[PDB]
Design a protein around this ligand. Structure first.
Ligand SMILES: CCc1cc(-c2nc(O)c(C(N)=O)c(=O)[nH]2)nc([C@H]2CCCC[C@@H]2C(=O)NCc2ccc(Cl)c(Cl)c2)n1
Ligand SMILES: CCc1cc(-c2nc(O)c(C(N)=O)c(=O)[nH]2)nc([C@H]2CCCC[C@@H]2C(=O)NCc2ccc(Cl)c(Cl)c2)n1
Ligand SMILES: Nc1ncnc2c1ncn2[C@@H]1O[C@H](COP(=O)(O)OP(=O)(O)OP(O)(O)=S)[C@@H](O)[C@H]1O
Ligand SMILES: Nc1ncnc2c1ncn2[C@@H]1O[C@H](COP(=O)(O)OP(=O)(O)OP(O)(O)=S)[C@@H](O)[C@H]1O
Ligand SMILES: Nc1ncnc2c1ncn2[C@@H]1O[C@H](COP(=O)(O)OP(=O)(O)OP(O)(O)=S)[C@@H](O)[C@H]1O
Ligand SMILES: Nc1ncnc2c1ncn2[C@@H]1O[C@H](COP(=O)(O)OP(=O)(O)OP(O)(O)=S)[C@@H](O)[C@H]1O
Ligand SMILES: Nc1ncnc2c1ncn2[C@@H]1O[C@H](COP(=O)(O)OP(=O)(O)OP(O)(O)=S)[C@@H](O)[C@H]1O
Ligand SMILES: Nc1ncnc2c1ncn2[C@@H]1O[C@H](COP(=O)(O)OP(=O)(O)OP(O)(O)=S)[C@@H](O)[C@H]1O
Lengths: 159, 160, 160, 160, 160, 159
């Protein structure tokens, strides 16, 4: 736990897109911290507690990953726990631009943390929590987009 | 070559001449066209379902092969329940393109027998959306160029 | 060469140094600058119209020729009535570009006698936005880099 | 519903599975497909016109209704002369989008009776291009994933 | 307010109506306009320097305040040697926007007293560039809509 | 030298944009390898040898950086020397798209290397070797864009 990397998100719910990025980070750091965003406030569809648990179960095959939640600022978290790096994924141009502005502000707020970006794998580049929820609501097959324990909590939620 | 149905889905809240262009450019290529309004979505907007359909029925009068439908669930299931192999959508801008890439990639996982075909917006309609046409009508400016006469009366009346 | 008036529209909720940067790059180019705020947007921000106007006023009193007004109709009509022949907007990013390409296309059809001039944002304010600033303020961090002293004291008041 | 002919233009230097993917998604939609290659482009590729035509020919002989031709004038004129009312192109990325928006704008002014239909590339061929393939081939790596056996043997011949 | 010069730089190889639009929309805002053709650049293209200037001089006859110049070195130094505080450029598409962001950021390091102002291309000219207008003239199609009569003769003649 | 990261480029010539990215990587890996691209063939303006030397001198204040040159494929290099990560910078949307397609192909060619991306600092986001060469040719001031030893080799080259 000399190096620690943080992978932030709402994860509402975690998907195989998220998972890929976490899997492709596990062997490059001593520790991974998947940080879940609190309130904040933003409506639906899984509470904090459920989102954490879903994440915990999709990553239990990965010893160096831990799951936490923060209120404050993502850089304050990183500083709190000794993390020098933040990891995020880029699917698209829109991801890229949104990310440039957030990473700019993060650099001003603390110069000592870097954000490093990985491209989505091509299998997972159209996957959002939003679009998975959309298709789940109409009872479609989601087994290719989300881990099994998440598949269940969606079916459970959407009838 | 066989019987061919193509589906042109959307909110149509309300239909505009930008939408209609894509529909006229598709009639001479399939035997049937289903303009399909995917409501229940609530997630609702400014005209109700029946008025939206009504507005479409009116503006596509001059095209025999165009039916106006509604559907609730998944588009690909609509296509499949009626035997369409083809979804037709328009492209105006880079924002459209990315959003549609994601939708079509998903639609392809769900049912690989449906192809999505894209047409480029004419130059004259590239900037037009339902949204901005409603912003403009809300302040009573001239919308005659953006929508057909019958949609124009309904917007005047809605924002009177 | 007549008396030139330019208008700089926006919601300014709140004004930031990136809006200011644009305003300070516009003062010398025109006889009058009108910073124009949006009224009865029937859409709430963090600060009331009157607050927002007050904050601009103190953030611009150091300049010679800038006046803060509100409008509830169309931009091009405000322009029409005060005799403004130019609108000035700032471009930070590609998403700005496309959003703005559509509005000025519409603004040219509505009134083709107003031009919209765009300037690129300065490198050091590229990433600023009212939103990102309010976000940082809510977590009670140092926003001295991003807004004027008067705006900074009013954001600290807001977010405890 | 007349005899439909569609044209799939390009330089194909060489044809790759991403061009093929588009062609195989077009076979069933039209009576005839014309894969059209660029002649007297007074602009050299890695393979001569005749080589390029040969490689397409072997890469498409498994399909029912696809014919390989060359043209040295305008695309819309080739279309005009063979009675093709449609052009088919593949969209991989945002830079494709913009480049293509300009060409089809021009193609619509030149001849407004031809439509251009675009399809999104499959996820697994999004990143392919003749160039990236020639690059990988020059370093003599496994290109079996990216082009047909016939193209692969001809790229190995090229680059030792 | 003072004496004002604005510079509208470019290749103009050849000038088109897309270029001219940006120039007409700028004449009623500064006292002088210098269309400035930044050649020596070799890196040369299809009309020589004197013919490019010639083509511009002709097409801007109907605007008193427009001078046509040449310059070799840096644009910002040209601006400075003649006392222009303003560079005017057009925007058509997202490719333009990024390229111009980089240029303007550099120009701002080099001389912060020169402002670059951007105008959006009209809808009708959004797809037009010198390049495509030359592609089209090369195959003898109708270019009457893209360039003024005198530029049209020179292109007919160049690609006869 | 348990972890090694490779930072590829033509570096014709190295700039303060490149340097930033190399500086912001030095403390996250045991070793940095700045790899210079050979022929390949592409005209002007500095030969391989000069580009390497310029790089060597701009980074000699950074002990864990080394400078090499490769002919073959970038993934073959990484595999040759035990490097699991490739680092590149993103300035813009155009960088992003060009990069997505290259990183896709790299993943096919070797799944065991990741490319990680950092955003240009805002000071350096309009800087290319091309635009620096352009302005240098007209004798303008470049001291804010390139290191001192590079400033000289440009002035020397462009009179
Ligand atoms: C790079 C990941 C990221 C993501 C987001 C981000 N923050 C939201 O609050 C929503 C949201 N719910 O709307 C959302 O969509 N993205 N916000 C940020 C920061 C951007 C600059 C200001 C400070 C931001 C910051 O740090 N904000 C608190 C925070 C976020 C995430 C986590 Cl894990 C924690 Cl612990 C704190 N960087
Ligand atoms: C991510 C950095 C990068 C950059 C480039 C790249 N390669 C050029 O050859 C030019 C060029 N000169 O045109 C150029 O602009 N970019 N090429 C690649 C690879 C893309 C996919 C095919 C294999 C490529 C590959 O590995 N190609 C050889 C190579 C490049 C760079 C170095 Cl250091 C080495 Cl050692 C080998 N990835
Ligand atoms: N399919 C994916 N592949 C790679 N990265 C992803 C993928 N989906 C999300 N990410 C990234 O993982 C991080 C956490 O994303 P979230 O904020 O949880 O939401 P999201 O699922 O990307 O988008 P929404 O809000 O559902 S539309 C972000 O940096 C995303 O860009
Ligand atoms: N002006 C236009 N030109 C060409 N196609 C369009 C135009 N406007 C809409 N379309 C397309 O017609 C289909 C139905 O669109 P809708 O889902 O009704 O959304 P929209 O009106 O384009 O966007 P908003 O939300 O008002 S900004 C989509 O493929 C649209 O992209
Ligand atoms: N940091 C900036 N630099 C340059 N221009 C800006 C900046 N911020 C806002 N502007 C421009 O000023 C005008 C008014 O913007 P507003 O609508 O008040 O704020 P905004 O850009 O919507 O902020 P958000 O919603 O937080 S992303 C528009 O032309 C903006 O692009
Ligand atoms: N991998 C692909 N997937 C989908 N469409 C493609 C693919 N590659 C090429 N195309 C399309 O097929 C048509 C002909 O392309 P060409 O000009 O032959 O190749 P290209 O796309 O220019 O390749 P380059 O120059 O190496 S990037 C165009 O519509 C391309 O976008
Ligand atoms: N159709 C157009 N509408 C508005 N502005 C344009 C148009 N075409 C060119 N301009 C602008 O006029 C200025 C001079 O452009 P040039 O450097 O001559 O390049 P160009 O002809 O736009 O591009 P190419 O290389 O032919 S694709 C630039 O700011 C251009 O962006
Ligand atoms: N100013 C910069 N800031 C951050 N990264 C950069 C910067 N300039 C270049 N890079 C990156 O460093 C790597 C090496 O770039 P090069 O291929 O050497 O050329 P370049 O200088 O980006 O572009 P050209 O060819 O000069 S237009 C690439 O991944 C670039 O995207």
């Amino acid at each position: 736990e000399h190096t620690i990397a943080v992978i932030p998100g709402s994860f509402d719910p975690i998907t195989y897109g998220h998972l890929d990025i976490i899997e492709r980070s596990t062997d490059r750091f001593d520790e991974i911290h998947v940080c879940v965003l609190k309130n904040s406030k933003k409506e639906g569809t899984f509470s904090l507690e459920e989102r954490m648990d879903l994440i915990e179960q999709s990553v239990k095959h990965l010893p160096n990953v831990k799951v936490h939640q923060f209120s404050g600022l993502l850089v304050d978290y990183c500083e709190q726990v000794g993390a020098k790096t933040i990891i995020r994924g880029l699917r698209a141009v829109s991801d890229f631009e949104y990310e440039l502005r957030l990473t700019s502000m993060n650099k001003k707020l603390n110069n000592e943390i870097e954000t490093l970006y990985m491209m989505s794998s091509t299998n997972y580049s159209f996957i959002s929590s939003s679009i998975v929820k959309e298709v789940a609501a109409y009872r479609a097959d989601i087994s290719e987009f989300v881990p099994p324990y998440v598949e269940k909590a969606l079916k459970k939620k959407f009838k």
